[PDB]
Amino acid sequence: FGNSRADMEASGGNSFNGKGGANASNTFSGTLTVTVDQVLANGNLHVVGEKQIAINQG
Amino acid sequence: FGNSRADMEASGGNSFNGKGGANASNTFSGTLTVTVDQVLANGNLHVVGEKQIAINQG
Ligand SMILES: O=C(O)[C@H]1C[C@@H](O)[C@@H](O)[C@@H]([C@H](O)CO)O1
Numbered sequence: 405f406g407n408s409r410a411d412m413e414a415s416g417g418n419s420f421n422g423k424g425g426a427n428a429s430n431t432f433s434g435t436l437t438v439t440v441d442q443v444l445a446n447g448n449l450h451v452v453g454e455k456q457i458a459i460n461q462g
Numbered sequence: 463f464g465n466s467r468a469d470m471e472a473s474g475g476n477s478f479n480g481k482g483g484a485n486a487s488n489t490f491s492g493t494l495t496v497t498v499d500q501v502l503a504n505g506n507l508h509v510v511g512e513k514q515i516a517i518n519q520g
């Protein structure tokens with residue numbers, strides 16, 4: 405060890421960060437009167453309805 | 463002792479400190495409905511279940 409033959413110095417680093425996300429929301433707060441389309445074998449009713457409103461410009 | 467023949471002075475030190483540690487934790491807070499795969503001899507049930515959710519983009 406007379407010289408710096410044994411003198412040693414070293415550093416090392418490794419950092420990793422990963423992220424991920426997702427969202428999906430929906431809301432509906434109306435009331436619509438529909439009409440029966442047909443009666444199924446079990447008695448369930450197929451209902452279809454439509455409502456058109458022309459407030460102004462569309 | 464006329465000269466510094468007996469005059470003496472010396473110092474010495476040796477300090478060592480080592481440390482080590484480790485941690486490992488995990489948590490899981492879900493609910494999943496599984497289905498029986500087979501019935502063992504002692505009556506134990508082999509249960510396997512799977513649930514796939516596509517929120518959006520994955
Ligand atoms: O004993 C040896 O082998 C050495 C001592 C150091 O001086 C070393 O650096 C080398 C030098 O390269 C000679 O020129 O020689």
Ligand SMILES: O=C(O)[C@H]1C[C@@H](O)[C@@H](O)[C@@H]([C@H](O)CO)O1
Pocket residue numbers: none
């Ligand atoms: O009695 C001796 O042997 C000594 C006395 C000191 O003077 C010592 O240092 C030595 C010196 O080297 C002579 O030149 O001689």
